[PDB]
Amino acid sequence: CIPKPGCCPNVASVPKLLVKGGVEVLSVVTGEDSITQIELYLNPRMGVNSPDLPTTSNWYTYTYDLQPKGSSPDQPIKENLPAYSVARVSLPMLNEDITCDTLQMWEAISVKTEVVGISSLINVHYWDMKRVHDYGAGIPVSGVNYHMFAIGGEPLDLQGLVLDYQTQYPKTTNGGPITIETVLGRKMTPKNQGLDPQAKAKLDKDGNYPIEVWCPDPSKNENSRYYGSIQTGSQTPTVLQFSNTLTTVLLDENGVGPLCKGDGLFISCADIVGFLFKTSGKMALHGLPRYFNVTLRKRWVKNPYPVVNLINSLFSNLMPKVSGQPMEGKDNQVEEVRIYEGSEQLPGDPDIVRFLDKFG
């Protein structure tokens, strides 16, 4: 009891939707050609990081009043240090094949993003705003802008750089932010005021890596895709775009996207929109959330790490350690290493040099 297919008018075809719902639907098993698409959001962390606090939640997505100390050295408080936002999405664990030494792994291909709440900025009638002139309206949110987001299978690697090492950031033992001297274990030097390879860290926590200290490391971030921009000025305007037709492709020059190591998706962002010119003349920054629409798929990859050697590390018996003289690092005690493979015709110099600069 079915109609003739030649009679039916042609109709286009589209990707078949199987499931739509909350995060619970990630535990659904799927075929190999399936495609998963996650929509989430991240509120900004501008020092005031929670509305549930009874006392000081009135300035959520804001910052306590910013102003220089006037006397060396600077001693800023946690609230005046905007920090990156970050979150992890626990993806479902996929299949693996031992006999081929291969395994599926989640790959991100495209993300759709836009800043939410842009239209809120036209509020020129906040009661404590600073009027541009007598009997006029206030000065809308404008000035400094720092926009940045990143997606990858690893936590975002990042580099440290400070405008002035003289600053004494709040101590970490209070559970607060993480500055450079927390990582290095020693006070910063003028080196840290420029680039310092010693100063590196991975984006572990939310609201604890101040933006004015840490910047994304372009070297190590190879399994992640980060985009950013800046705009610094007294009252420079806030220019922003938003639409749902813009899609950004995350694929690389090899045609592969970020690989979700550990069956986890790592997302991070931060958006500063400008100051809030209070009537008293004080200032305070403001931030807005971001909407993320990650498009994921399944890719087959070879297992790079030997299984047995891994578990061997976990046992003290099969991986004995010793607190001996240094054989790695700056003070290593290995004078030379030579690696031979195969055979060739006899060279005329056992002290082979490879650099023309070395002949002198």
215 binds, among a second copy, Ca ion, none (CB under 5 to 8 A by kind): a second copy
* Residue span 249-288 as binding mask against a second copy, x where in contact by CB under 8 A, dash where not: ----xxxx---------------x-xx-x-xxxxx-xx-x
Has 219 been labeled as part of a binding site?
yes
- The answer to whether 274 and 125 have CB atoms below 8 angstroms apart is no
The residue number with the shortest CB distance to Ca ion is 219
Beta strands 285-287 and 264-275, pairing class: antiparallel
Q: How many other CB atoms sit within 10 Å of the CB of residue 134?
A: 5
Burial 141-173 (b: 16+ CB within 10 A, else e): bbbbbbbbbbbbbbbbbbbbbbeebebebbeee
Task: Identify the bridge partners of residue 162 per DSSP, sorted by sequence position.
Answer: none
Pick 31 or 347: Cβ nearer a second copy: 31
Q: How many residues bind a second copy (CB under 8 A)?
A: 135
Candidates 70-78, 305-313, 322-330, 341-349; binding stretch for a second copy (CB under 8 A): 70-78
Q: Rule CB under 8 A: which of 297-336 touch a second copy?
A: 299-302
Cis ω on the peptide bond leading into residue 304 (within 30° of 0)? no
For residue 244, state whether it binds Ca ion (rule: CB under 5 A): no
| DSSP-derived 3-state class of residue 311 | helix
Backbone φ, ψ for residue 254 (5° rounding): -85, -10
- The answer to whether 207 and 83 have CB atoms below 8 angstroms apart is yes
Pick 137 or 318: Cβ nearer a second copy: 137
| Euclidean distance between CA atoms 44 and 57, whole angstroms | 14
Q: Which amino acid is at 151?
A: I
Cα-to-chain-centroid distance, residue 258: 13
Question: What element of type H or E holds 180?
Answer: helix 180-184
Has 222 been labeled as part of a binding site?
yes
Q: Rule CB under 8 A: which of 93-152 touch a second copy?
A: 97, 99-100, 102, 112, 114, 116-129, 131-142, 144, 146, 148
Least distance from a second copy to the Cβ atom of residue 108, Å: 13
For residue 243, state whether it binds Ca ion (rule: CB under 5 A): no
Least distance from a second copy to the Cβ atom of residue 124, Å: 6
| Euclidean distance between CA atoms 306 and 296, whole angstroms | 27
* Residue span 34-53 as binding mask against Ca ion, x where in contact by CB under 5 A, dash where not: -----x--------------
Pick from 47, 78, 80, 260 the residue near a second copy by CB under 8 A: 80
Has 338 been labeled as part of a binding site?
yes
Pick 134 or 357: Cβ nearer a second copy: 134
Q: Rule CB under 8 A: which of 188-247 touch a second copy?
A: 189-191, 193-195, 197, 211-219, 221, 225-245, 247
Pick 111 or 141: Cβ nearer Ca ion: 111
For residue 55, state whether it binds Ca ion (rule: CB under 5 A): no
| Euclidean distance between CA atoms 115 and 99, whole angstroms | 46
| Euclidean distance between CA atoms 157 and 202, whole angstroms | 4
- The answer to whether 50 and 85 have CB atoms below 8 angstroms apart is no
For residue 162, state whether it binds a second copy (rule: CB under 8 A): yes
Pick 100 or 319: Cβ nearer a second copy: 100
Q: Which amino acid is at 90?
A: S
Candidates 154-162, 177-185, 306-314, 328-336; binding stretch for a second copy (CB under 8 A): 154-162
Backbone φ, ψ for residue 163 (5° rounding): -65, -30
For residue 219, state whether it binds Ca ion (rule: CB under 5 A): yes
Q: Which residues bind Ca ion (CB under 5 A)?
A: 39, 219, 222
Binding residues for Ca(2+): 39, 219, 222, 336, 338
